[PDB]
Design an enzyme around this catalytic site. Sequence first.
Site, mmCIF file in Angstrom:
data_model
loop_
_atom_site.group_PDB
_atom_site.id
_atom_site.type_symbol
_atom_site.label_atom_id
_atom_site.label_comp_id
_atom_site.label_asym_id
_atom_site.label_seq_id
_atom_site.Cartn_x
_atom_site.Cartn_y
_atom_site.Cartn_z
ATOM 1 C CG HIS A 23 19.785 63.099 13.478
ATOM 2 N ND1 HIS A 23 19.727 61.861 14.094
ATOM 3 C CD2 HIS A 23 18.835 63.856 14.061
ATOM 4 C CE1 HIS A 23 18.798 61.885 15.029
ATOM 5 N NE2 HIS A 23 18.249 63.090 15.037
HETATM 6 C C1 S9T Z 1 17.767 64.506 4.564
HETATM 7 O O1 S9T Z 1 17.705 64.337 6.011
HETATM 8 C C2 S9T Z 1 16.977 63.374 6.648
HETATM 9 C C3 S9T Z 1 16.087 62.531 5.997
HETATM 10 C C4 S9T Z 1 15.388 61.583 6.725
HETATM 11 C C5 S9T Z 1 15.593 61.463 8.089
HETATM 12 C C6 S9T Z 1 14.903 60.502 8.772
HETATM 13 C C7 S9T Z 1 13.714 61.127 9.506
HETATM 14 N N1 S9T Z 1 13.595 60.428 10.789
HETATM 15 C C8 S9T Z 1 12.301 59.734 10.995
HETATM 16 C C9 S9T Z 1 11.723 59.116 9.735
HETATM 17 C C10 S9T Z 1 11.544 60.138 8.816
HETATM 18 C C11 S9T Z 1 10.379 60.163 8.025
HETATM 19 C C12 S9T Z 1 10.189 61.201 7.086
HETATM 20 O O2 S9T Z 1 9.076 61.310 6.269
HETATM 21 C C13 S9T Z 1 8.024 60.356 6.524
HETATM 22 C C14 S9T Z 1 11.168 62.212 6.971
HETATM 23 O O3 S9T Z 1 10.912 63.202 6.059
HETATM 24 C C15 S9T Z 1 11.935 64.230 6.028
HETATM 25 C C16 S9T Z 1 12.332 62.176 7.767
HETATM 26 C C17 S9T Z 1 12.532 61.137 8.703
HETATM 27 C C18 S9T Z 1 16.493 62.292 8.759
HETATM 28 C C19 S9T Z 1 17.178 63.266 8.034
HETATM 29 O O4 S9T Z 1 18.074 64.139 8.637
HETATM 30 C C20 S9T Z 1 17.900 64.120 10.098
#
Ligand code: S9T
Lengths: 142, 142
Positions: free
Chosen positions: A75
């Site tokens: 990712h």
């Molecule tokens: C800053 O990096 C990222 C931020 C968000 C994501 C998406 C990640 N996937 C499932 C939904 C989801 C839900 C979240 O909080 C409810 C979350 O918090 C970090 C991360 C994610 C992925 C990330 O890197 C993999």
Amino acid sequence: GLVGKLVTQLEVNCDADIFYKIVKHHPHFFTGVQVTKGDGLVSGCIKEWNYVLEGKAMTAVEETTHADETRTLTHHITEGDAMKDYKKFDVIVETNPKPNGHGSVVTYSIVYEKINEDSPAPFDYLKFFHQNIVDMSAHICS
Amino acid sequence: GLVGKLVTQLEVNCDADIFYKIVKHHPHFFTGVQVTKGDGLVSGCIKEWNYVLEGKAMTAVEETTHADETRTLTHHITEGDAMKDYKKFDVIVETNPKPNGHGSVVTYSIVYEKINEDSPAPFDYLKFFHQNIVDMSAHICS
Ligand SMILES: COc1ccc(C[C@@H]2NCCc3cc(OC)c(OC)cc32)cc1OC
Ligand SMILES: COc1ccc(C[C@@H]2NCCc3cc(OC)c(OC)cc32)cc1OC
């Protein structure tokens, strides 16, 4: 030191190839698109996430790639709140059989480069990704 | 999953062998003893630490071993507050040259086994060890 990597590794009682296939296909939501490689088959995706981390609403844009032969998901974050702290932020998920043969080892690595020496290291993200794979892993059994 | 490993890895602008020698010889205090190997030369130590982590006073008993040829320190925790959460808790510090030749990569790994599925993973320890090596690394220069 501005460049670093955080890792959480967990043992899971599941065959590596099946577990990888589960992880690969999976307050928050996303919008985005799927990416193909030329044969029209999905090879990845690009998503804009809206999510809440330790109570604060954030956005990120994530490009995901997979490598079936090594059971690796990558990712790549290109934009969003995290990029206020990091020049580079990539999350690599690997699943491999335990050399014991049967179960698996799952490794989440956060590869980062901070903007400056006052930036935090992404322990809040490591804990989030950890709990998420623990939670997923507790919804699976033989 | 009860068995896991947490890692923080940092780049440092310092030759690996010198940095390892610095780390090896270094609210909290300890009492304890040094361990020898037969030639009367110190090979390690056994310490009882009294320390404060996220505001709470704790104790641990730590047996430390070193491996000069691999620039590895191993801290084996046998007793103390952490063992209320973990059956096994080991901290491994490795220092290696960057394949770029010049600087170093320092890896702190916490290898753990939780008592039960309700035990936390040691993110509070990872952050402590991380900040400690960042702090040490910011008191060194060419
Ligand atoms: C800053 O990096 C990222 C931020 C968000 C994501 C998406 C990640 N996937 C499932 C939904 C989801 C839900 C979240 O909080 C409810 C979350 O918090 C970090 C991360 C994610 C992925 C990330 O890197 C993999
Ligand atoms: C439960 O595991 C451990 C607990 C304490 C230690 C000792 C460690 N070394 C420097 C002094 C010191 C001081 C600390 O807080 C002020 C501390 O907090 C975790 C840890 C340490 C080491 C440990 O494992 C390496």
